[PDB]
Design an enzyme around this catalytic site. Structure first.
Site, short mmCIF file in Angstrom:
data_model
loop_
_atom_site.label_atom_id
_atom_site.label_comp_id
_atom_site.label_asym_id
_atom_site.label_seq_id
_atom_site.Cartn_x
_atom_site.Cartn_y
_atom_site.Cartn_z
N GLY A 71 36.95 45.78 43.32
CA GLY A 71 35.67 45.54 43.97
C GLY A 71 35.22 44.11 43.84
N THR A 72 34.12 43.75 44.49
CA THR A 72 33.61 42.40 44.36
C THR A 72 32.87 42.26 43.03
OG1 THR A 72 31.38 42.47 45.30
CG2 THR A 72 33.25 42.52 46.84
N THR A 73 32.72 41.03 42.55
CA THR A 73 32.08 40.81 41.26
C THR A 73 30.58 41.09 41.33
OG1 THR A 73 33.69 39.06 40.71
CG2 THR A 73 31.66 39.16 39.36
N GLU B 121 28.57 39.27 44.37
CA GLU B 121 29.39 38.64 45.38
C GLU B 121 29.55 39.54 46.61
OE1 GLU B 121 33.95 36.97 45.36
OE2 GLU B 121 33.54 38.71 44.08
N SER C 233 30.34 47.77 41.52
CA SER C 233 31.55 47.23 42.10
C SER C 233 32.52 48.38 42.26
CB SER C 233 32.16 46.16 41.19
OG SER C 233 31.27 45.07 40.94
#
Lengths: 220, 246, 234, 190, 246, 115, 249, 237, 200
Positions: B34-36, B51, B79
């Site tokens: 996942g994104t941060t 993010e 995330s």
């Protein structure tokens, strides 16, 4: 799991495999009657359950296959027959009763946690106030159809071939005695034999071993 | 490690012979893609940042909001499989409302943390569901001050000074750790906002191939009166400019 | 080969944390025919290519109105599309009856997401194997959303889904700066859309039989054009 | 001297996967020798596999473009024969045919002194009884569970070797599908 | 899991019941001996740590004032059966007739409970066998074994669990139909002494009798028609007493 | 089946339970409990290596009731599931029976849920 | 790179890796097992015909019932595992009569069709979110023929996947691949009912192994004025005579 | 797949039913013989230890009411469940009609319960076969069996459990179509004697016959010593 | 047990070897197909075609009923009888083990591991590459599919690609040929997902 890639339903086709293992059952329409014949020790048979059952006063059901499965259908049919008398104030036509029974069978092939009935049936008799003999057959799938003469169960393919060349729709057996005889003949091809005669307006009579033995011996 | 637990990793709630639940650890692998996202506990509050990967210029900017509010006082960011994240937040909203209905006071943060935890661990109990494919960073202000938590697919959660999850989590954690070392006396909310922007920016070097958009929210006694608010306008741009300078 | 062990139901992670049943659901969309969505600040438009079974058959509807200010287009499992669009119709309707309020498109997307998500986390069912492009016009203006089998819903200026949809999607990225400015000019927004979907044709042409168009916007209720209604754009 | 390893097509395909570890981890000492008749197998045509480390493609014949169901491999040094088998028997009945007409004759030829048989077993008559009756022999089963046995197979091969650096065949890279997993993730849940 | 987990195998045997018996056969020995004026039931108290206090657990349980039980196999299965057995004695018998059930009928209810675990969906059979000792006005003293299958048999004497083969043998030699309770107690001790590895005193042995009515255990006087309970568990002291003058 | 659900193995064992025991050591910390004349003390290791953690929120001890404490060996989410259940049991007990749930009675109750 | 078995096609709720529901496609396959059914629409009515396919001379083909009335303005033909048609027919009749009770008008033919397809979905989630009514899809399909005031004469093809197409002519069941190809060549917008009736027999005679008569084939039609009529043996035999005598050409 | 109890095999066979029947063929043998004026039930006990309390039990034969008894072969605990439903069915019929239940009607109902387990619900069938001995004024003395298939048939004489084919052969040999209840007893004891893998402690015995004092029907569950005294007088002593 | 019997197989410019799934590529009239027979036995048969200077060997597959031993033995006969005439061979089929359309030759394998080909065209290709009578010159067209052998399903894209490439190799015109193939494709169950209305 339910369907094969060519579209058969597995459990249903397996239900047909149960009927094949079942004892032979046959019915044939005369001019003014319908006969039912079935096949079969050290057992009492005056109390033992027979293979042909009155559904109402004028209609019978026989079967081939998983014996114990057939009681549920017989019971369901008998109840519906009374429900029909109660609500329409007229007894079932043979065709109606056949739809009902086959519809029950179809349903057991489309509910979860439920096995299809391993029985095919012969349903026969006379509609109220009508003297055209009626004969239907049902299958585990819930298909049903009308027959001049029909057989189900083990060696029914043999017996059916017999009736195709010994039953003539142009001239159906003209008497109850001919009709019974042709039924007894059809069974001796693959055969202790049951015979039940149904005449119009509720004349339903099961022949004793005696009168049956008078038939089989003469044939032989 | 045996990363693959052959014969014991085919259905949830099964214990491997070493007492692991592999489905839960696999659910973690999805979280790591996942994104941060991060959280920073500050002096009288908490800050969240995420993010957001601009996969195509067809995305409309500043839409597709990721941070969610629960009640009026709690923020959540996660995330991994985003829809699992919304699912969990929906549960949190009912739990919060249900608490507020009987007891009148808004649900305290540790109480809210445990509602989410039990629900998340309940999904490691049966093979008829799968674990949540998110790690969730969340918290806010209550009668006892600021609280920040992170909750994993296992149902495990703890309170944090700073929390990071998602693809760039190692980088982010390192900056979170420097931040801690460098601020024994505490961190103002405004400061935490700017510092949060910097951290998401550094973590983004893991997804450097794609553009990104920064999303930041906070809940602070002095800045938002202990309500959850999205950081916007000048404060946002000020943090964006600061992050970029580094 | 290894994937074969972890893809039996939507309730099983692969060792890298994939849900293959959801990934497979995505593939169902590629079996559908292409549809495009795009928008400016005043209008939102859908364009679909409809399929027939042969020359004796009708062409299958691809666009479904969900309310006066909202509708969608689909690519993938037709039944799934029927289920999810009825659900949207109900949610719009609920919003109106109880609140005298048009359901925001952004809120429609969220409701849709949560419903589809549930199918991906419990044993018994399957993810929805259909893609939806949702257009609407609410208090915050014109919108376009894309729905994925995973439940994930994304807000976009334009997109395309279904078979060969990459061409249109590339064209929409390439033309982005232009089409988003087509305000107060609905036929021109439609022309952009038809042009986009054209990039997805392989040895086939847009006809009054296969081309379906939808539009909604300011003072413009959700309207679906088929048959001779699409000729001016061909 | 000479020894042939015959992998069986069994639980989790570990024998086959073991062979993949062995042949690619030892990419230098190994060579494609010949095909065997795949008459009794589900017949197979593929590309040429080649180790994950940029090393040499074991198929030294620069003109051969395809691989087959049944292939013997040859260690120039350690004097070993290795069969890789892509597909299983076309039916359970032809196991007898396969041993007789394909395995035995290959054993006569090349003068193999000893065959080693790799097999897998599973919680719930076993093929070598079929095979044995159709005769130095080493080996049989191992205790296994499907699937993703990329690591069970190594531990098996790590276990047999007694009595290095491990390379995958480049085919393993697609064992979760050809489609990029990062692209799928971003489409679905970003 | 809405289907039986005990099913027939091609040999006609039911595996889960057999494996349940295996668990029973693995348990600590326990035994029962029926006298002319009483019944005795006994077992060993293996403490699975010396820091454990074995007195806080009870392997011999009062079911009614006149009926008690002991077991071999899985303890927690037993504990739970004990709770169920006490309740069914009130719900299906005492609340209807104002009387405690006679032994054979209470045995029969417990048998039902166990049979049900071998047929109902989603469950394993109980992993215990019980010995049950009782008295009732119309049948006098009795002794039954119930198995994981729900089968029960009446015994004059028997043993179950690990050392049961030798114990059943010992009991075959010493038993006759004129033992008085005191003989039966003595014999039970000698029997348990073979099975017992390790310590053997009043603290590692549990022992109870169904014998005469104890008015002193009633708890009240004044209803002369009120019978004392026939069940009594022997103290540590009482057991050691017999052991020294063995 | 017998390696995955709580049914008997041919040796009359329950594997998932055995494996469940293995889970209890996963947090790699020890506890001990000792009784005094008039008190009971429970002690457990506390290992908080990550410096981003708030150590004050890390605990495997729980106040079940005014009189009952519990310490758990095993992963925290199963730990907190049990803690919640025991707390509820102890409250229900006091409400229904009109006195505080004894420690051994709470233990038995939880033992039964476990069986 | 090894050949291993695939469980892509076992459960009804299981996707294959490329997004197919194979158990559902197998139910679509099931129609092949049925006897031939053929529908042809014109501006003067829609003709529905079927192959009876008695499996034995002892069968009274009169009781072979593969065309049924749904309402005065709608009839249908079935092919496949026909016992499954029980529910569909029942539901259709109830849909039509219920629509009239509630709205004082005839149910539109497409609606009726849509209604049967909704029932077909009930091995899974309903179109309005209902829970499942049955444990497998049906293994039968229907040609639904009718007239309404909005769209005139219509012919629909209802599949056990709960989907449908409208057709100008359509053949299903065994032998339909060729039957449909004939229909592709022969159908045109100006066909009369009579021509449509003859084209149906002609295509049936072609595909039917057994020789075409009034006992192994049955015709029927819907007209806006007389509604649905199943033709009897007499009328159909006459039509067959006229077909023979026309193929003098 | 043969673990699943309500699905057909590819041969249209029901495996769990068949395996349940295998289990029964390993149970203690039970015979039933109908005489002109009575019926005999006999069961050889599966379990034998000298420490077994042989009197005060009877765990293979059961009164269902005043007029009907059963002999069991299979899991005794399975049996008890169905025995209890039967006793209840018989009492409901008595309550509804104020008549005793016709034997076949009680039999059909238990057979229906067994049948049910073979068609729906996913539960294993009962591992029991029953021989029903009863009297009613419609059909007089009757003998039936039922098995986990849910089938039932009427008999003049019959056996279930172990060595059934050996027993059936002897009964086919020495059965007269109209014997006397005292001979049927003898025949029963002989036939159990010729198949035992035989003392009183290993037998349960019952009769249903005209009380001779008078005109009424009586069910006797023989005591152990009674079994002894009847074991000697027929020369098996 | 012992050794089982094996199907005895009893037996121009261009030979096309394929399966029954590819029937739409050969419109019976448009190219005027003629016929000759071909039998095998074990202890089944299928017709050969011509049009009219080119042979067409199209095997019937059926996962359910026809064991692959038959196709193994058939491939073995067809390839051996053919090698002693040196025709140019065309193989057309499908694979569920490939991720895109494949065109391959005797000296170019466009498969990429772990993609591969079974069962009948696999057998055919084995004979053409390996074992006796190897060395023949062939081009091979393969489309992705799903489903068991004899029940294959294809995308409408891939049915399209098959038509272009195959008509072109056969040197027909991309008009009448395309049109006559698509007609046959749509009547076939290979496209049942589209024809049913399931995917739109």
């Amino acid at each position: 799991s339910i369907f094969s890639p060519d579209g058969h339903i597995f459990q249903v086709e397996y239900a047909l495999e149960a009927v094949k293992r079942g004892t032979c059952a046959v019915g044939v329409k005369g001019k003014n009657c319908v006969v039912l014949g079935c096949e079969r020790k050290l057992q009492d048979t005056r109390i033992t359950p027979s293979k042909v059952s009155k559904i109402d006063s004028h209609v019978v059901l026989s079967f081939s296959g998983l014996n114990a499965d057939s009681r549920i259908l017989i019971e369901k049919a008998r109840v519906e027959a009374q429900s029909h008398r109660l609500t329409l104030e007229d007894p079932v036509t043979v065709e109606y009763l056949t739809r009902y029974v086959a519809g029950v069978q179809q349903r057991y092939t489309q509910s979860g946690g439920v096995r299809p009935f391993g029985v095919s049936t012969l349903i026969a008799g006379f509609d109220p106030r009508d003297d055209e003999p009626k004969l239907y057959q049902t299958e585990p799938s819930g298909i049903y159809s009308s027959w001049s003469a029909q057989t189900i169960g083990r060696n029914s393919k043999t017996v059916r071939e017999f009736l195709e060349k010994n039953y003539d729709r142009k001239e159906p057996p003209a008497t109850v005695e001919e009709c019974v005889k042709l039924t007894v003949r059809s069974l001796l091809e693959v055969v202790n034999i049951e015979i039940t005669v149904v005449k119009p307006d509720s004349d339903i009579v099961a022949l004793s071993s005696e009168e049956i033995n008078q038939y089989v011996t003469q044939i032989e | 490690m045996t990363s693959i637990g052959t014969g014991y990793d085919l259905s949830n709630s099964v214990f491997s012979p070493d007492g692991r639940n592999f489905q839960v650890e696999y659910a973690v692998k999805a979280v790591e893609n996942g994104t941060t996202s991060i959280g920073i506990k500050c002096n009288d509050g908490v800050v969240f940042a995420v993010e957001k990967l601009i996969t195509s210029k067809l995305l409309v900017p500043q839409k597709n909001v990721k941070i969610q509010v629960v009640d009026r006082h709690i923020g959540c960011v996660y995330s991994g499989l985003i829809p699992d994240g919304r699912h969990l937040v929906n549960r949190g909203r009912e739990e919060a409302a249900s608490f507020k209905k009987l007891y009148k006071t808004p649900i305290p943060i540790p109480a809210f943390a445990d509602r989410l935890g039990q629900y998340v661990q309940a999904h490691t109990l049966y093979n008829s569901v799968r674990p949540f494919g998110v790690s969730t960073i969340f918290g806010g202000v209550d009668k006892n001050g600021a609280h920040l938590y992170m909750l994993e697919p296992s149902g495990s959660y703890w309170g944090y000074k700073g929390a990071a999850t998602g693809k760039g989590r190692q980088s982010a954690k390192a900056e979170l750790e420097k931040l801690v070392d460098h601020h024994p006396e505490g961190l103002s909310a405004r400061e935490a906002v700017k510092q949060a922007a910097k951290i998401i920016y550094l973590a983004h070097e893991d997804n450097k191939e794609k553009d990104f958009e920064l999303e930041i929210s906070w809940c602070s006694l002095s800045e938002t009166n202990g309500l959850h608010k999205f950081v916007k306008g000048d404060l946002l741009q000020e943090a964006i400019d600061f992050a970029q300078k580094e | 080969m290894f994937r074969n062990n972890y893809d039996g139901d939507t309730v099983t992670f692969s060792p890298t944390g994939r849900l293959f049943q959801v990934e497979y659901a995505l593939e169902a969309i590629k079996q559908g025919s292409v549809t495009v969505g795009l928008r400016s600040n005043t209008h939102a438009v859908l364009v679909a290519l409809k399929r027939n079974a042969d020359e004796l058959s009708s062409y299958q509807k691809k666009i479904i109105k969900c309310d006066e200010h909202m509708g969608l287009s689909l690519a993938g499992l037709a039944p799934d599309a029927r289920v999810l669009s009825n659900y949207l119709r109900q949610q719009c309707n609920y919003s109106s009856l109880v609140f005298n309020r048009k359901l925001a498109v952004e809120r429609a997307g969220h409701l849709l997401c949560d419903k589809a998500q549930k199918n991906t986390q419990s044993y018994g069912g399957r993810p929805y194997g259909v893609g939806l492009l949702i257009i609407g016009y609410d208090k915050s203006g014109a919108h376009l959303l894309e729905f994925q089998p995973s439940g994930n819903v994304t807000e976009l200026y334009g997109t395309a889904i279904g078979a060969r949809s990459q061409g249109a999607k590339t064209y929409l990225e390439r033309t982005l700066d232009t089409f988003i400015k087509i305000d107060g000019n609905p036929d021109e927004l439609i022309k952009a859309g038809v042009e986009a979907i054209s990039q997805s044709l392989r040895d086939e042409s847009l006809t009054v039989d296969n081309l379906s168009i939808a539009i909604v916007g300011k003072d413009t209720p959700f309207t679906i054009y088929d048959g001779e209604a699409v000729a001016k754009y061909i | 001297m000479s020894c042939l390893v015959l992998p069986l097509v069994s639980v989790g395909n570990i024998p086959q996967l073991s062979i993949d570890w062995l042949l690619n981890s030892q990419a230098n000492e190994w060579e494609y020798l010949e095909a065997l008749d795949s008459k009794y197998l589900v017949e197979f045509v593929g590309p040429l596999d080649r180790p994950e480390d940029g090393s040499d493609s074991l198929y030294k014949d620069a003109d051969m473009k395809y691989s087959s169901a049944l292939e013997v491999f040859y260690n120039k040094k350690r004097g070993l024969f290795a069969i890789q088998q892509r597909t299983p028997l076309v039916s359970v009945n032809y196991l007898n045919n396969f041993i007789v007409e394909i395995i035995l004759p290959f054993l006569s030829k090349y003068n193999i002194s000893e065959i080693c048989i790799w097999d897998s077993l599973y919680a719930m008559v076993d093929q070598p009884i079929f095979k044995i009756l159709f005769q130095s022999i080493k080996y049989c089963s191992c205790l296994a569970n499907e699937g993703d046995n990329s690591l069970d197979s190594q531990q098996f091969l790590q276990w047999i070797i007694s009595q290095v650096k491990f390379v995958r065949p480049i085919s393993w890279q697609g064992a979760y599908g050809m489609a990029d997993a990062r692209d799928k993730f971003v489409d679905l849940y970003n | 899991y809405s289907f039986s987990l005990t099913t027939f195998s091609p040999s006609g045997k039911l595996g889960q019941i057999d494996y349940a018996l295996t668990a029973v056969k693995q348990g600590v020995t326990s035994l029962g001996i029926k006298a002319t004026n009483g019944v005795v039931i006994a077992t060993e108290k293996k403490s699975s740590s010396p820091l454990a206090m074995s007195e806080t657990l009870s392997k011999v349980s009062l079911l009614t004032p006149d009926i008690g039980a002991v077991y071999s196999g899985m303890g927690p299965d037993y504990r739970v059966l004990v709770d169920k057995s006490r309740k069914v004695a009130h719900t299906s018998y005492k609340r209807i007739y104002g009387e405690y059930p006679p032994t054979k009928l209470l045995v029969s209810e417990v048998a039902k409970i166990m049979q049900e675990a071998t047929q109902s969906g989603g469950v394993r059979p109980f992993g215990v066998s019980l010995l049950i000792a009782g008295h009732d006005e119309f049948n006098g003293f009795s002794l039954y074994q119930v198995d994981p299958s729900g089968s029960y048999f009446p015994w004059k004497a028997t043993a179950i669990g690990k050392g049961s083969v030798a114990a059943k043998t010992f009991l075959e030699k010493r038993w006759n139909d004129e033992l008085e309770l005191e003989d039966a107690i003595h014999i039970a001790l000698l029997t348990l002494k073979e099975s017992v590895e390790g310590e053997f005193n009043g603290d590692t042995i549990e022992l109870a009798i169904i014998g005469d009515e104890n008015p002193d255990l009633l708890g009240y006087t004044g209803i002369p028609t009120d019978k004392g309970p026939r069940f009594r568990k022997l103290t540590s002291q009482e057991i050691n007493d017999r052991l020294e003058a063995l | 089946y017998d390696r995955h659900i709580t049914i008997f193995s041919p040796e009359g064992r329950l594997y998932q339970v055995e494996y469940a025991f293995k889970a209890t050591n996963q947090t790699n910390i020890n506890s001990l409990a000792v009784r005094g004349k008039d008190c009971t003390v429970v002690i457990s290791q506390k290992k908080v290596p990550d410096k981003l953690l708030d150590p004050t929120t890390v605990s495997y001890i729980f106040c079940i009731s005014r009189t009952i404490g519990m310490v758990v060996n095993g992963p925290i989410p199963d730990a907190r599931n049990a803690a919640l259940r025991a707390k509820a049991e102890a409250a229900e007990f006091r409400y229904k029976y009109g006195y505080d749930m004894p420690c051994d009675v709470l233990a038995k109750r939880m033992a039964n849920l476990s069986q | 790179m090894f050949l291993t078995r695939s469980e892509y096609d076992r459960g009804v709720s299981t996707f294959s890796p490329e997004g197919r529901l194979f158990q559902v496609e197998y139910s679509l396959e099931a129609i092949k097992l049925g006897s031939t059914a053929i529908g042809i629409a014109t501006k003067e009515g829609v003709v529905l015909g079927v192959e009876k396919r008695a499996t034995s001379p002892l069968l009274e083909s009169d009781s072979i019932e593969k065309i049924v009335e749904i309402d005065r303005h709608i009839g249908c033909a079935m092919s496949g595992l026909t016992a499954d048609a029980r529910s569909m027919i029942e539901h259709a009749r109830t849909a039509a009569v219920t629509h009239n009770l509630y709205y004082d008008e005839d149910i539109n033919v497409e609606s009726l069709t849509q209604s049967v397809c909704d029932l077909a979905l009930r091995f899974g989630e309903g179109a309005s979110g209902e829970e499942r009514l049955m444990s497998r899809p049906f293994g039968v399909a229907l040609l639904i023929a009718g007239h309404d005031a909005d769209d005139g004469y219509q012919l629909f093809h209802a599949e056990p996947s709960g989907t449908f197409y409208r057709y100008n002519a359509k053949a299903i069941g065994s032998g339909s691949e060729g039957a449909q190809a004939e229909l592709l060549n022969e159908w045109h917008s100006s066909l009369t009912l009579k021509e449509a009736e003859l084209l149906v027999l002609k295509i049936l005679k072609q595909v039917m192994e057994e020789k075409l008569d009034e006992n192994n084939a049955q015709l029927s039609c819907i007209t806006k004025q007389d509604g649905f009529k199943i033709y009897d043996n007499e009328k159909t035999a006459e039509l067959i005579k006229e077909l023979k005598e026309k193929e003098a050409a | 797949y043969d673990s699943r109890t309500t699905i057909f095999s590819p041969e249209g066979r029901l495996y769990q039913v068949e395996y349940a029947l295998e289990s029964i063929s390993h149970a203690g043998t039970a015979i039933g013989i109908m005489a002109s004026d009575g019926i005999v039930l006999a069961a050889e006990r599966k379990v034998t230890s000298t420490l077994l309390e042989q009197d005060t039990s009877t765990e293979k034969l059961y009164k269902l009411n005043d007029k009907i008894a059963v002999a069991v072969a299979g899991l005794t605990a399975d049996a008890e469940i169905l025995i209890n439903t039967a006793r209840i069915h018989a009492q409901n019929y008595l309550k509804t009609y104020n008549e005793d239940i016709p034997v076949e009607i009680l039999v059909r109902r238990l057979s229906d319960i067994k049948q049910g387990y073979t068609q729906h619900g996913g539960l294993r069938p009962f591992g029991v076969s029953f021989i029903y001995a009863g009297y009613d004024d419609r059909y007089g003395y009757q003998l039936y069996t039922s098995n986990p298939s849910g089938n039932y048939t009427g008999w003049k004489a019959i056996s279930v459990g172990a060595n059934t084919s050996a027993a059936q052969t002897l009964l086919q040999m020495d059965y007269k179509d109209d014997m006397k209840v005292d001979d049927a007893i003898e025949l029963a004891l002989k036939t159990l004697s010729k198949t035992t893998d035989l003392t009183y402690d290993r037998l349960e015995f019952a009769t249903i016959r005209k009380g001779a004092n008078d005109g009424e029907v009586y069910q006797k569950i023989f005591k152990p010593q009674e079994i002894k005294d009847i074991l000697v007088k027929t020369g098996i002593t | 047990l012992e050794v089982c019997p094996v199907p005895k197989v009893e037996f121009y410019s261009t030979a096309v070897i394929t399966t029954k799934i590819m029937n739409p590529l050969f419109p019976k009239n448009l190219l005027q197909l003629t016929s000759i027979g071909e039998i095998k036995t074990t202890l089944f048969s299928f017709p050969i075609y011509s049009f009219g200077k080119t042979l067409l060997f199209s095997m019937e597959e059926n996962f359910i009923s026809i064991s692959p031993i038959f196709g193994n033995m058939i491939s073995r006969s067809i390839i051996s009888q053919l090698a002693q005439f040196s025709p140019d061979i065309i193989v057309i089929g499908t694979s569920d083990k490939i991720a895109s359309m494949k065109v391959m030759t005797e000296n170019e394998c466009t498969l990429q591991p772990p993609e591969f080909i079974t069962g009948f065209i696999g057998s055919v290709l084995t004979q053409l590459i390996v074992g006796p009578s190897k060395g023949l010159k062939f081009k091979c067209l393969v489309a992705p599919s799903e489903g068991p052998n004899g029940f294959e399903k294809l995308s409408l894209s891939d049915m399209g690609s098959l038509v272009d490439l195959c008509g072109q190799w056969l040197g027909f015109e991309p008009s009448r040929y395309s049109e006559e193939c698509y007609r046959l494709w749509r009547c076939d169950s290979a496209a049942i997902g589209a024809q049913s209305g399931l995917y739109i």
